Write a protein that binds this ligand. Structure first.
Ligand SMILES: *[C@@H]1O[C@H](CO)[C@@H](O[C@@H]2O[C@H](CO)[C@@H](O[C@@H]3O[C@H](CO)[C@@H](O)[C@H](O[C@H]4O[C@H](CO)[C@@H](O)[C@H](O)[C@@H]4O)[C@@H]3O)[C@H](O)[C@H]2NC(C)=O)[C@H](O)[C@H]1NC(C)=O
Ligand SMILES: *[C@@H]1O[C@H](CO)[C@@H](O)[C@H](O)[C@H]1NC(C)=O
Ligand SMILES: *[C@@H]1O[C@H](CO)[C@@H](O)[C@H](O)[C@H]1NC(C)=O
Lengths: 49, 97, 48, 114, 49, 97, 49
């Protein structure tokens, strides 16, 4: 289990801010299928030749 | 082995049927403690995640403080929330209880 | 386990290969679904 | 429509991290999305205020806009990147006073110097 | 078949591809579109033994 | 096999084969339908965690009924159980605005 | 297209300018983006490259 960064709450009127000091860009790649191959069948030929 | 040393629990026992009929039930990808770990870490992230701009920083603030910002954000003024903090917590608690 | 049956079953083509592959794919689908779902529930930062 | 023709604010809808821009190319049976996100790193912990009030004038309070008020006295940082800058009228909003706001009496930022 | 039972109109379902279309929908009026119909068969020109 | 000779034995075994092949095809067809459905549903769960739990939603009816305030998630036998806490108004009055 | 209110007008602005508005919109201040424009472009380029 990959634990998240633990950030403690404070007993006060203040709060802890876990804030980045660095960054990177990255690319999430995603494929979405929109079609399937369209097929027709000559059923009479398929079955009886 | 349970299905041999004890046998079927009842009529139509579909777990013991596996070794008889020829089918198998496979285990899930994650065990219970791992799934619990995911939702537990999720619980602890709620107050500090739905707080401000960006998804990159975490505000470790009290749950209660988060609720009051959430209520203010839907149209309940701060004067009201301030006068009613105990009333609000009690209603919330009734809803979950 | 009856050999006569298995002999006749063969005349239906690779029937069982199709059953196994279809279910194998269907089962992988849940492992992928679960992996993706939890990857997204996962927090970056969290309080104890 | 959500990703490519717009910047999305929906976590996880587009890619992981904070969405910035997406691109689309065709794929053999559909579309291939190229989601560029912002990924933070090297997080540090700092102490923040919920807001700041003029201690002498307790009804005059501010809250940060799309960022935080941090100790360093008080300064502002944007929410996605730690980089303290002065608290100004361009990074604050006036708010009603709250019990969690700090009472500041010395180096009051310009929105409270009234 | 008319109300009085006589056949007044018919399609020879093997005449052409358009006729095959009407027969497959069992109708003299089918909607506009592009439809697959039975293939045009290659026929033997002889035999080898 | 014990009762019949091959020319008839074959026909009888073949009836059992056809019935069992049919059963397995039906089973597989349903596992594919059910796994496709569960996968779509899993993406809905994904959206709810991000929209509901990790954020306060402004989408009426997406999360729960009423105005969304906060949601929680626990695991369930075949998925996730969402706990959506909403704000429910009552005793409306009419005023002039 | 992803620049301002409405879907009816088009701002023919540089890609780079669009990126900086997109980064500002998620919490990176303008002082930071201004100091780091070359750093940001390089990180973006690494992500795609
Ligand atoms: C920065 O200065 C502010 C302003 O002084 C300060 O917040 C104030 O703190 C006082 C308490 O220290 C709050 O006064 C009361 O606190 C008690 C705590 O239990 C409440 O129960 C009281 O509520 C009753 O009385 C109210 C009077 O009108 C009623 O309206 C209410 O219904 C109850 O009958 C009362 O709140 C005071 O309200 C806050 N001020 C604000 C704006 O909330 C703040 O704490 C200082 N900053 C820091 C970090 O110390
Ligand atoms: C510290 O936490 C305890 C927990 O019960 C609380 O009672 C106490 O008032 C807190 N102190 C401060 C400064 O908030
Ligand atoms: C950010 O991380 C990269 C990773 O190699 C590092 O090279 C760079 O120096 C880091 N910047 C800061 C401010 O730490």
């Amino acid at each position: 289990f990959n634990h998240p960064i633990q950030v403690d709450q404070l007993n006060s009127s203040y709060f802890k801010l876990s804030i980045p000091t660095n960054f990177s860009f990255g690319v999430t790649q995603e494929y979405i299928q929109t079609t399937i191959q369209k097929v027709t069948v000559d059923c009479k030929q398929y079955v009886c030749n | 082995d349970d299905c041999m040393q004890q046998g079927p629990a009842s009529a139509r026992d579909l777990i013991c049927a596996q070794y008889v009929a020829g089918y198998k039930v496979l285990p899930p990808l994650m065990d219970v403690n791992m799934e619990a770990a995911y939702t537990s870490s999720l619980l602890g992230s709620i107050a500090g995640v739905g707080w401000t701009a960006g998804l990159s920083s975490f505000a470790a603030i009290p749950f209660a403080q988060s609720i009051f910002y959430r209520l203010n954000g839907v149209g309940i003024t701060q004067q009201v929330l301030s006068e009613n903090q105990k009333l609000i917590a009690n209603k919330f608690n009734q809803a979950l209880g | 386990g009856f050999q006569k049956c298995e002999q006749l079953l063969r005349e239906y083509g690779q029937f069982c290969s199709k059953i196994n592959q279809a279910l194998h794919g269907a089962n992988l689908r849940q492992d992928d679904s679960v992996r993706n779902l939890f990857a997204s529930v996962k927090s970056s930062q969290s309080s104890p | 429509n959500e990703c490519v023709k717009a910047q999305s604010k929906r976590s996880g809808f587009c890619g992981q991290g904070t969405h910035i821009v997406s691109f689309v190319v065709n794929a053999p049976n559909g579309l291939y999305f190229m989601h560029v996100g912002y990924y933070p790193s090297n997080h540090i912990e700092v102490v923040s205020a919920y807001g700041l009030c003029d201690a002498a004038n307790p009804t005059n309070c501010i809250a940060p806009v799309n960022g935080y008020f941090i100790k360093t006295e008080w300064s502002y940082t944007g929410s996605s990147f730690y980089a303290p800058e002065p608290i100004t009228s361009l990074n604050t909003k006036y708010v009603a006073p709250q019990v969690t706001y700090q009472n500041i009496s010395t180096n009051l930022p310009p929105p409270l110097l009234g | 078949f008319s109300v009085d039972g006589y056949i007044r109109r018919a399609i020879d379902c093997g005449f052409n591809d358009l006729s095959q279309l009407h027969c497959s929908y069992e109708s003299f009026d089918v909607e506009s579109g592009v439809y697959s119909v039975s293939s045009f068969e290659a026929k033997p020109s002889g035999s080898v033994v | 096999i014990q009762r019949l000779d091959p020319p008839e034995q074959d026909a009888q075994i073949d009836r059992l084969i056809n019935g069992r092949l049919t059963t397995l095809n039906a089973f597989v067809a349903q596992q594919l339908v059910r796994s496709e459905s569960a996968a779509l549903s899993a993406q809905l769960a994904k959206d709810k965690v991000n929209e509901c739990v990790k954020a306060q939603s402004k989408r009426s009816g997406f999360c729960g009924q009423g105005t969304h305030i906060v949601s929680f998630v626990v695991n369930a036998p075949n998925g996730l159980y969402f706990m959506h806490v909403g704000y429910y108004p009552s005793n409306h009055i009419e005023v002039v605005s």
